[PDB]
Amino acid sequence: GASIVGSWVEPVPGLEGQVQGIKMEEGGVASSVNMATLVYESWKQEGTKLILTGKSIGNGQTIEFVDTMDIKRLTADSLVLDNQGMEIRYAKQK
Template identity: 55%
Template sequence: MNKESKNTSKHTRTFLHIFSAAVLLLLAACSTPKNQLTGSWTQPIPGQETKMQGFKLDADGKASSINMSTLQYESWSSKGKQLMLTGKSIGNGQTIDFTDTLLIQKKTADSLIIKRGNLELAYGRQR
């Protein structure tokens, strides 16, 4: 291998390392780590703004409902910008298993905005 080929090969490897690092950083920026989602997330109950409802996400993947007796969350997971909540819907004498797949629109330390179809829901972190 001549000197010019060695330099080209070295530049190619350097470029691939930089490109790979950039892709990994981009992927990390596009997803919400599971530990950033753990905690209690609430919003005012429509028509009863002094009362709150929502869900609690535990680090072990368990989920629970806050002030929603007919919607019982049991577990959760996330992948990229998706939040999946599973549980049971209870009403009219029947219980139905469900999985809600929600799109995370925005996440800050104190707020979580998710979307289900055309419905956008805003939650605040409960302290």
């Protein structure tokens, strides 16, 4: 099957032509693609579970998070995630 390693993006809501997302690299490092508030730091995949970590700058604080989601689709071109009922649809940044 396809590997999750790569850059995954989606259109920026409300900003036509712009994209945002996450770059997942070999070695477990993840980084934000075109986002200022969400700072991704790592990823880990355990079967259909994806665990993403980083920090969120907001409400006068910087708070580390650990978000656990289900991988619903993973192909050479697409990655679809279910994060507690919110679906996230990404396309592979070529």
